Design a protein around this nucleic acid. Sequence first.
DNA 1: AAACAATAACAGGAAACCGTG
DNA 2: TTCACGGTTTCCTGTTATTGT
Lengths: 106, 89
Amino acid sequence: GPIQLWQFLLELLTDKSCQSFISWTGDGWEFKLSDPDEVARRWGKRKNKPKMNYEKLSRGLRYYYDKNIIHKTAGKRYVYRFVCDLQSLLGYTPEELHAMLDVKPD
Amino acid sequence: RRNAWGNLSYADLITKAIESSAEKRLTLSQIYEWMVKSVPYFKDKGDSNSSAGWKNSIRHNLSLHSKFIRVQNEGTGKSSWWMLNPEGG
DNA sequence: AAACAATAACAGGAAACCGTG
DNA sequence: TTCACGGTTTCCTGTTATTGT
Ligand SMILES: [Ca+2]
């Protein structure tokens, strides 16, 4: 059906030109929305919700905490973490994926 | 004239809103309505939403200040009563 | 130096919305 | 077809961090 937010973020996190606004932090499947308005804008375009913003996007991220899909990294602005089994879905370790995308660690 | 409405702080305003009530308690929504009906500056900011920057300042003052305490309200709906702290912290 | 204002990140309830089976 | 559901989207209440006055 319609793509789901978490799949959308993964899509952006696997495309290296998106790195300026959303990137892996280099710790596992922890990532950062370094420019959350640009990420929300794309999410709005993709779902055809022209009024999408980070306030609303983040609320959908917050429903994922109980579904153990994504969790918040407490005290780090705009930092979240996939806590589902990404290794199985992607066929790569964090280390492998980080090399592939030339991830400078945080 | 430190603020647009005068020398009163937000907190002094909320205090006056709550003291004006028959039962010495109001909901956030009622505090909003008081501001709009009672403080000349806010008189034309009535049909605006919680993102209003001054609604944010009210929520922010109600949680930050120990002089305000939140109390649960009976049925479903139907948000907390805000009252002054008998100790006034 | 301490109070207050401004503003935003964040948690999570409620209800509308809408595409799909 | 209509219907019910999940996944938001929208809005809100409440708590907290930060930076400017
Ligand atoms: Ca309080």
